[PDB]
Specification:
This is part of a larger assembly, with 2 copies of chain A and 1 copy of chain B (451 residues).
Chain A (H helix, E strand, L loop, with lengths): L2 E7 H17 L3 E2 L3 E2 L4 H5 L5 E4 L3 E4 L1 E5 L3 H7 L12 E3 L8 H7 L5 H12 L5 E9 L4 H16 L4 E7 L11 H12 L5 E5 L1 H10 L8 H7 L1 H6 L2 H4 L2 E3 L3 H8 L7 E7 L14 H8 L16 E9 L4 H14 L12 E6 L9 E8 L3 H15 L5 H5 L5 H21 L20
Parallel strand pairs in A: 1-6, 1-8, 6-7, 8-9, 9-10, 10-12, 13-14
Antiparallel strand pairs in A: 2-3, 4-5, 11-14, 12-15, 13-15
Helix pairs in contact in A: 1-3, 1-6, 1-9, 4-6, 5-6, 6-7, 7-15, 7-17, 13-14, 15-17
Chain B lengths: L2 E7 H17 L26 E4 L3 E4 L1 E4 L3 H8 L12 E2 L9 H7 L5 H13 L4 E9 L3 H5 L1 H8 L7 E7 L11 H12 L5 E5 L1 H9 L9 H15 L7 E3 L5 H6 L9 E5 L14 H9 L15 E10 L3 H13 L15 E4 L16 E9 L2 H17 L5 H4 L5 H17 L1 H4 L15
Parallel strand pairs in B: 1-4, 1-6, 4-5, 6-7, 7-8, 11-12
Antiparallel strand pairs in B: 2-3, 9-12, 10-13, 11-13
The chains are: A alpha/beta (445), B alpha/beta (451).
The structure holds guanosine-5'-triphosphate, guanosine-5'-diphosphate (2 copies) and magnesium ion.
PDB class: structural protein
Keywords: Complex, structural protein
Entry title: tau-microtubule structural ensemble based on CryoEM data
Chain lengths: 445, 451, 111
C-alpha cells in the first residue's frame, strides 16, 4: 500500500544487504525459494512493502545490487537467499573502484550509473505508491561510497520529494580498514548532505564492543554484526509494515528527527542485547529497554553521547506495551538526564510502537538519536584529511581520476562548515541576539 | 429526526473511533456486522437510534461514521478487523501518503488532495439526515493529520452547513508526557485555523487518563485500548439524550448555549465518574453526592491541570441511569455552597443539569464495574490558561531558533502562518485573563481627596 | 408557530364559548420560554377578550439547571407581563422540599 526501494552498493553495502534480506524474508514468512510458507496473514498483508508479487506464490525483493567488482555478487548468488534476487536486478562492473572514491564517482561507476537507473526505473514505475529509497554502504569505501552517492544524486533528480535514507558504516576510530577513509568519507559527505533526508552513522568497533560486552562473544564476525545492525533497518520500517498503537511512516520519523536541513546524521541503538548465558536473568521490561537504549556505551556509533546534547531522539518499540510505560520511561530518562539535551528543543522524543515483535522473542526497541557528539567523528575526519591534504598524500590517485584541487577544498570546507555549525548547536542557550546599551539624558533643550 | 455524524481524523481519531463504535452498537443490541438480533417492529418502531445509524435491507444497521488517515495501516484495521462488516466500505477512506506528524501536508498538499472526496461522501450522509444537527470531529491537536485535516474540514463544513452544530473532540496536550517533538507546532496551527469554527470543543488528556487507569481503575498496564475504552463512556454520556428517553435530556445545541460565555471560550475540559477497580466497586456507596464529589476532585480531572489554579465560569453535569432530580439538586447545592470550589466573581448562573433514564453499560473483555448510575462533566475555567502558558513556553524556544520550520515550508506553508498562530495565542492568553478578573468598576488616574 | 395557530383555531371553532388559554411551560427552558412567549404574544392579537393564563416553571434561588436562565426568564417576563392574565409561579426548589418535608419522600422524582 506504500512501497520502499533499496540499494545494495559496494562490498559492505551488499554484505549487510544479504543478512538484512535474510531477516526480512523471515519476518514476512518467506522461504529462501522466493515463496511464502509463513505463519501470519499479516505477513502477507504487507509483503508488498519490500517485495514484488510475481506469479504463482512467488516474491522477488525490491533490491537493486550495485558494484564495480563482481565478487560479492558471486557470493550473494551462491549464498543463502541467493535464488530470490532476480537476475536483471544485479547491475555490476568488472574493473572496480580499487578503494578510490573518485574512480567510483568520476571514472568507472559513472560509466555504469545510467544502466543502473534503468533497473531503478523499472522498479519505480511499478510501485505507484512509492514512498522512498534506501541505501546501504561503506562511507570509507570506494564503491558504496563513490558510486552510491552519484546514484543517490541521480535518484534525487528523478524522485525529488521521496524520502532518502542512508545506512553508512563509518571510518574506523583508532586504526583504518582502508587508508583513504578520511578522503572517501569527506568526499562522500559533500554529495550526501544535499541529497539525503536521513543518514545513519554505524561504528564497527562499537559493534565489536557491543558483541564482547552485551552479547559477551569474543569472536563476532560479519554475520553477527550484519544481524546486530539489521534490527535498526527492520526496526525503523516495522511501524509501516505491521500495525501498532503508534504506527509510523518513514517521513513521520525524519520530520521529528531533523530540526535543520543538514542536521541529519544519527547515532543508532537497540535493546535488548544480552548473552546466551544471561537471557535467563535480565528482565524483559520497558525500563530495561529504555535504559539499555540510552546507555552511553550501548550506542552503535563512534561517539559518547555524554560528550554532546541530544537535539532529537526517536524510539521505535516492538511487542505489546503499556503505552503508559513507554511514556513514563521517556519522561523519567529525560528527567534523569536533562543536561544531555538541547534545552530550547524541549521534549526531545518521538515514539512509535509496533505490535509485532522480533522473531520468537517477546519484545524489542530501536533507537535513532541526534546527539551533537557526532561532531567528534567529523572533527576526526576533518583533522585527518587536513594531514593528508596539506602534503598531497594519496592525492595523485584522485586528481589522476580528474578531480580538481577545488573539489577536495570545497569538500573539506563543506565538512568544516558542518563541524562549525555543530558547535553552534552544542550547549546552546535560548539567546536572542542583543548587544550592550546605555542611558541617555532627560535634560531636554 | 435528530441525526449526528462523526469524523474520525488521523491515527488517534481512528483508534478512538474503534472504541466508540463498539459501544454504540453494544448499547442497542446491534452486533458487529450491523445486525439487530431481535426486532419488535421490522421496518419501524424503537429504533430510537436512527440518530446514530441509517437502516437498510431487512433491518441491518449502517452507522453514521467516517474514518480517514492517509495511512492504510490504520484504516485497513477497520476493513479487516472484528467490525469490518458493520461500516460502509466508502466510509473507510484513505490517502496515498500519511502526514508525518505535520500540518502542511494536510492543509496545503495531500489532505488538500482528499478533502473533496471526503466532503462528497459527507454530503451523501448529510442529505440522508432528515434532521441534521451537525457533525463531530475526533482528533489530536498534536496529530499530523489530526492537525492538518481537521483544520481543512472545518474550513469546509462551517460554510457548507453553517448554522449546523460544529463540534470537535480533541486529545489535548499533556503537561509532562509527550509523543512527538513536533506537537506544539501541530496544536497551535490548528487553534489558529479552527477555533474560529467549533461552537464547542471537548477536551481530554492522556496524562490524566493514564492516572485514572493507574489510580481509580487500578490497572497496572494501560494500553491505548484500555484508555480509549474509557473515553467511549464520555460521548456515550454526552449522546444519551439522543439515543434514549428520560426526564431532562440535552441536545448537542445546549452544551454550546450553556458552556460558552464568549465564542473563543468554548474549550471545556471533561471528566467522567464513577471510576473504580473491581475491588473498590464492592465497598463504595456510589450515591449521587459521592459521585459528584469525585467529579470535582482535582486528581480525577480528564485534563491534567488542577481546576483550583483556575476559576470556574460555567459547567455541564449530566446524570445517567439510577438518578433522582432532588438528589442531584442536593449535590449541586453542596458544590455550590462550597464557594471554596471556585467560581468567578461575576457568575450569576454556572450550571447545566440533565437526566437520562438509561444506565451506564460497559464492554466485553475486562474486569469492569457495572454501575447503576454515572455523571459526565465538562468544566469551563481559567485553568486551561496554565496549559496555554505551556504552549507559550514550548513554542518560543523552537520558533525563535526557527527549529523544524522547513518541513512545514516544503509542504505548502507560509512563515507568517506560524507567527500569526502564535499571535492568536498571545490573544488567547489575554482572552482568558480578561475573564478570570473580578467585576469591579473604574478607570484612569487619581492621587487626591474627594472628601 | 403558524401551523400551531391553525390547530389552536381548529380547537377554537370546537368551543361553543371559548373560555381562554391555559399553558404549562418552563421559563428556564428554550422552547417553553421563547416559542411560548412567541405564541402568548400572538394569541393576544387574535383572542382579545379571552383570558390567557400560565403555569410556569420559574428559576429557583439555590441551584440552576440551565445557564441562560436569567436571560430566558427575563426575556420571557417582558412578553408575559403585557400579554397574559395570570402567572402561576411554580418552583422546583419548593417542590423538592414539599416532597421531602411534608410527604417524607426520601427521593423525590419528577413523577
Ligand atoms: N488518546 C490517544 N491518543 C493517541 C492515540 N494514538 C495516538 N495518540 C495521540 O495522537 C497524536 C499522534 O497521532 P499522529 O501519529 O500524529 O497521527 P496522524 O494524525 O494520522 O498524523 P499522520 O499519521 O502523520 O497522518 C499524539 O499527539 C498522540 O499522543 C490513541 O489511540 N489514543
Ligand atoms: N559492518 C560490516 N562492515 C563490513 C562488512 N564488509 C565490509 N565492511 C566494512 O566496510 C569497509 C569496506 O568498504 P567496502 O564496502 O569494501 O568499499 P567499497 O566496496 O569500495 O564501497 C570497511 O570498514 C570494512 O570493515 C560487512 O558485511 N559488515
Ligand atoms: N418541574 C418540572 N420541570 C421539568 C421537568 N423536565 C424538565 N424540567 C425543567 O425545565 C427546564 C428544561 O427545559 P426544556 O424543557 O428542556 O427546554 P425546551 O424544550 O426548549 O422548552 C429545566 O428547568 C428543568 O428542570 C419536569 O417534568 N417537571
Ligand atoms: Mg496519519
Amino acid at each position: 500500500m506504500r512501497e520502499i526501494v533499496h540499494i545494495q552498493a559496494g562490498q559492505c553495502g551488499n554484505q549487510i544487504g544479504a543478512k538484512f534480506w535474510e531477516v526480512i524474508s523471515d519476518e514476512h514468512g518467506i522461504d529462501p525459494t522466493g515463496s511464502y510458507h509463513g505463519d501470519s496473514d499479516l505477513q502477507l498483508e504487507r509483503i508488498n512493502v519490500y517485495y514484488n508479487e510475481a506469479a504463482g506464490n512467488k516474491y522477488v525483493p525490491r533490491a537493486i545490487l550495485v558494484d564495480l567488482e563482481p565478487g560479492t555478487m558471486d557470493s550473494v548468488r551462491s549464498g543463502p537467499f541467493g535464488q530470490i534476487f532476480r537476475p536483471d536486478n544485479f547491475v555490476f562492473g568488472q574493473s572496480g573502484a580499487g578503494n578510490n572514491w573518485a574512480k567510483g564517482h568520476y571514472t568507472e561507476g559513472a560509466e555504469l550509473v545510467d544502466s543502473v537507473l534503468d533497473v531503478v526505473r523499472k522498479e519505480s514505475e511499478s510501485c505507484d505508491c512509492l514512498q522512498g529509497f534506501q541505501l546501504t554502504h561503506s562511507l570509507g569505501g570506494g564503491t558504496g561510497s563513490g558510486m552510491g552517492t552519484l546514484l543517490i544524486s541521480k535518484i534525487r533528480e528523478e524522485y525529488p520529494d521521496r524520502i532518502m535514507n542512508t545506512f553508512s558504516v563509518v571510518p574506523s576510530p583508532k586504526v583504518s580498514d582502508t587508508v583513504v577513509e578520511p578522503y572517501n568519507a569527506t568526499l562522500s559527505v559533500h554529495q550526501l548532505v544535499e541529497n539525503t533526508d536521513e543518514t545513519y552513522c554505524i561504528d564497527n568497533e562499537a559493534l565489536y564492543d557491543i558483541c564482547f560486552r552485551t552479547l559477551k562473544l569474543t569472536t563476532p564476525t560479519y554475520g553477527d554484526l550484519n544481524h546486530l545492525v539489521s534490527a535498526t533497518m527492520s526496526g525503523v520500517t516495522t511501524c509501516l509494515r505491521f500495525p501498532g498503537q503508534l504506527n509510523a511512516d518513514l517521513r513521520k520519523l525524519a520530520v521529528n528527527m531533523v530540526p535543520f536541513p543538514r542536521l541529519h546524521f544519527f547515532m543508532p541503538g537497540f535493546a535488548p542485547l544480552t548473552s546466551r548465558g544471561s537471557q535467563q536473568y535480565r528482565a524483559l521490561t520497558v525500563p530495561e529497554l529504555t535504559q539499555q537504549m540510552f546507555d552511553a556505551k550501548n550506542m552503535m556509533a563512534a561517539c559518547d553521547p555524554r560528550h554532546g546534547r541530544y537535539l532529537t531522539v526517536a524510539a521505535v518499540f516492538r511487542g505489546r506495551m503499556s503505552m503508559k510505560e513507554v511514556d513514563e520511561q521517556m519522561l523519567n530518562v529525560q528527567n534523569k538526564n536533562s543536561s544531555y539535551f538541547v534545552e530550547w528543543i524541549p521534549n526531545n522524543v518521538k515514539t512509535a510502537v509496533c505490535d509485532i515483535p522480533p522473531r520468537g522473542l517477546k519484545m524489542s526497541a530501536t533507537f535513532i538519536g541526534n546527539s551533537t557528539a557526532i561532531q567528534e567523528l567529523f572533527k576526526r575526519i576533518s583533522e585527518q584529511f587536513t594531514a593528508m591534504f596539506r602534503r598531497k598524500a594519496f592525492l595523485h590517485w584522485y586528481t589522476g581520476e580528474g578531480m580538481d584541487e577545488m573539489e577536495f577544498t570545497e569538500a573539506e570546507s563543506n565538512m568544516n562548515d558542518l563541524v562549525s555549525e555543530y558547535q553552534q548547536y552544542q550547549d546552546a542557550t535560548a539567546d536572542e541576539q542583543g548587544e550592550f546599551e546605555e542611558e541617555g539624558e532627560e535634560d531636554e533643550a | 429526526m435528530r441525526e449526528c455524524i462523526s469524523i474520525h481524523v488521523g491515527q488517534a481519531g481512528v483508534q478512538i473511533g474503534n472504541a466508540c463504535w463498539e459501544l454504540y452498537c453494544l448499547e442497542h443490541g446491534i452486533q458487529p456486522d450491523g445486525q439487530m438480533p431481535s426486532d419488535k417492529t421490522i421496518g419501524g418502531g424503537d429504533d430510537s437510534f436512527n440518530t446514530f445509524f441509517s437502516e437498510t435491507g431487512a433491518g441491518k444497521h449502517v452507522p453514521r461514521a467516517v474514518f480517514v488517515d492517509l495511512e492504510p495501516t490504520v484504516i485497513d484495521e477497520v476493513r479487516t478487523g472484528t467490525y469490518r462488516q458493520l461500516f460502509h466500505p466508502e466510509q473507510l477512506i484513505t490517502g496515498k501518503e500519511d502526514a508525518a506528524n505535520n500540518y502542511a501536508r494536510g492543509h496545503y498538499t495531500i489532505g488538500k488532495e482528499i478533502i473533496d472526496l471526503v466532503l462528497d461522501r459527507i454530503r451523501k450522509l448529510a442529505d440522508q439526515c432528515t434532521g441534521l444537527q451537525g457533525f463531530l470531529v475526533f482528533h489530536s491537536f498534536g496529530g499530523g493529520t489530526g492537525s492538518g485535516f481537521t483544520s481543512l474540514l472545518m474550513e469546509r463544513l462551517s460554510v457548507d452547513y453553517g448554522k449546523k452544530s460544529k463540534l470537535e473532540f480533541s486529545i489535548y496536550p499533556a503537561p509532562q508526557v509527550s509523543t512527538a517533538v513536533v506537537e506544539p507546532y501541530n496544536s497551535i496551527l490548528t487553534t489558529h485555523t479552527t477555533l474560529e469554527h467549533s461552537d464547542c470543543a471537548f477536551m481530554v488528556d492522556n496524562e490524566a487518563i493514564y492516572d485514572i487507569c493507574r489510580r481509580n481503575l487500578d490497572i497496572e498496564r494501560p494500553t491505548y485500548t484500555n484508555l480509549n475504552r474509557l473515553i467511549s463512556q464520555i460521548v456515550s454520556s454526552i449522546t444519551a439524550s439522543l439515543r434514549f428517553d428520560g426526564a431532562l435530556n440535552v441536545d448537542l445545541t445546549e452544551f454550546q448555549t450553556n458552556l460558552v460565555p464568549y465564542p473563543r471560550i468554548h474549550f471545556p475540559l471533561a471528566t467522567y465518574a464513577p471510576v473504580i477497580s473491581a475491588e473498590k466497586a464492592y465497598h463504595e456507596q456510589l450515591s449521587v453526592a459521592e459521585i459528584t464529589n469525585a467529579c470535582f476532585e482535582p486528581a480525577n480531572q480528564m485534563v491534567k491541570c488542577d481546576p483550583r489554579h483556575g476559576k470556574y465560569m460555567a459547567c455541564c453535569l449530566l446524570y445517567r441511569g439510577d438518578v433522582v432530580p432532588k438528589d442531584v439538586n442536593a449535590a449541586i447545592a453542596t458544590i455550590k455552597t462550597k464557594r471554596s470550589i471556585q467560581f468567578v466573581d461575576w457568575c450569576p448562573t454556572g450550571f447545566k443539569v440533565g437526566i437520562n433514564y438509561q444506565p451506564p453499560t460497559v464492554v466485553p473483555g475486562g474486569d469492569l464495574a457495572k454501575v447503576q448510575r454515572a455523571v459526565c462533566m465538562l468544566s469551563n475555567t481559567t485553568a486551561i490558561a496554565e496549559a496555554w502558558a505551556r504552549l507559550d513556553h514550548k513554542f518560543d524556544l523552537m520558533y525563535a531558533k526557527r527549529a523544524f520550520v522547513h518541513w512545514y515550508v516544503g509542504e505548502g506553508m507560509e512563515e507568517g502562518e506560524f507567527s500569526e498562530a502564535r499571535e492568536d495565542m498571545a490573544a488567547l492568553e489575554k482572552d482568558y485573563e480578561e475573564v478570570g478578573v473580578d467585576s469591579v468598576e473604574g478607570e484612569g488616574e487619581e492621587e487626591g481627596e474627594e472628601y
